[PDB]
Amino acid sequence: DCGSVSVAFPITMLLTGFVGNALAMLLVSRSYRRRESKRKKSFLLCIGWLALTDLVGQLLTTPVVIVVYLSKQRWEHIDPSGRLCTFFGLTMTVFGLSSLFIASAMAVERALAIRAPHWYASHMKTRATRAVLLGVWLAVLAFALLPVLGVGQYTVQWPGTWCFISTNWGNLFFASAFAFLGLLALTVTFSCNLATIKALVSRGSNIFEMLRIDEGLRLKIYKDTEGYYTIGIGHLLTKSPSLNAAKSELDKAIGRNTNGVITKDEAEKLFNQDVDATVRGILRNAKLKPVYDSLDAVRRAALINMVFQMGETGVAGFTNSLRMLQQKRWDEAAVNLAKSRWYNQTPNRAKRVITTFRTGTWDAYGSWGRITTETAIQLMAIMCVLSVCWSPLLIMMLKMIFNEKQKECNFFLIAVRLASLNQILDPWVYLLLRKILGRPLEVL
């Protein structure tokens, strides 16, 4: 095929891939080193690492492909020894699997953040995410080093412009392993992305999710530190030690026979009741009432959060902080709240609350604005792009293992070219398209 064999493909592919990935890295560096409030620096860390992984993979492969075209093909002439072909095979496989596993790591992380928000906020440290991206790399590099040892081999592919995984036992096992490793990556990505979208639709009110991150959600009847029956977001059922008395208390509050188990919607209903009662306490308190009225809906949630943690009297003791809230001295009020025994006992919770009072945003807890639909469309796009670009290669390889005269050589070049396109689209899908086309979103 005179059409498929052209130097115009690697030239335009390298050009588009280079610009996108070098710029994605530049924007990530400007957005991460800021030192603000949110610990979502790990999401920037993954995108930044993905851009680097994609850029290096293109810089190491494409110049060789260009050189063989200029020399008038015959890879075996330019490389009589097996060094460049095995190296090319290695660099194609290590950077190919790394892109798919980083895409999967992000999918898993987003899913954990939304499906288990309480556990995510306390268990992370950021050092774990940096170690995972290092570990994934070494595990992939070790697998890619198998033909060097003896398991499988890297051969010259049609039209003699590139090298890849060859398709008795060693060659077939190494090829099958790559095929199943690639399909596992796509299945893990699709599953976590579908789970995330489903959960974004299920999301409750902004107050509900705020206290879920701070206190946690339990849908089964459990005992607290004092031994009292509790459910949902810290809702005490009864002070009686009887389990029967607790199940009948929950059944009265809900309506139906729950038998210790409830739904997120029912937990939100019990939470909304607790919100009504805490507002009653605030309005009845002489000191908390003028503060509550002067504050906006977002800042009121930060006050309700404090009342849930310390109680009506506990919050009232912060006389100096409350006076600054009505006077709208947000920066000064933050300092006085930080100078407390509460801040030292629960540093992560106090930091998220103080930021909500200071900025008047949900930023410390998450997005939840118009970004909730923006993320849904972005996750949907990932699944579409990843499947069209990476499925033909993976299916072609499984077909080759299962065993002009054949037109498989022509389609295999189309298949690897599509898989290479995924690492050109990556900076656009994950960062650049949102950062550039952020204005037409408000227009539409």
Ligand SMILES: CCCC[C@](C)(O)C/C=C/[C@H]1[C@H](O)CC(=O)[C@@H]1CCCCCCC(=O)O
């Ligand atoms: C198998 C998946 C590898 C994907 C990768 C890790 O991202 C590396 C691909 C790099 C491409 C780049 O995107 C432009 C280029 O040239 C590289 C090799 C393309 C395959 C060989 C085709 C040879 C030809 O054009 O005749």
Ligand SMILES: CCCCCCCC/C=C\CCCCCCCC(=O)O
């Ligand atoms: C606005 C988003 C930017 C997207 C840029 C698109 C980059 C496309 C670059 C090169 C085309 C790659 C060719 C892959 C198709 C394989 C078919 C073939 O070999 O004929």
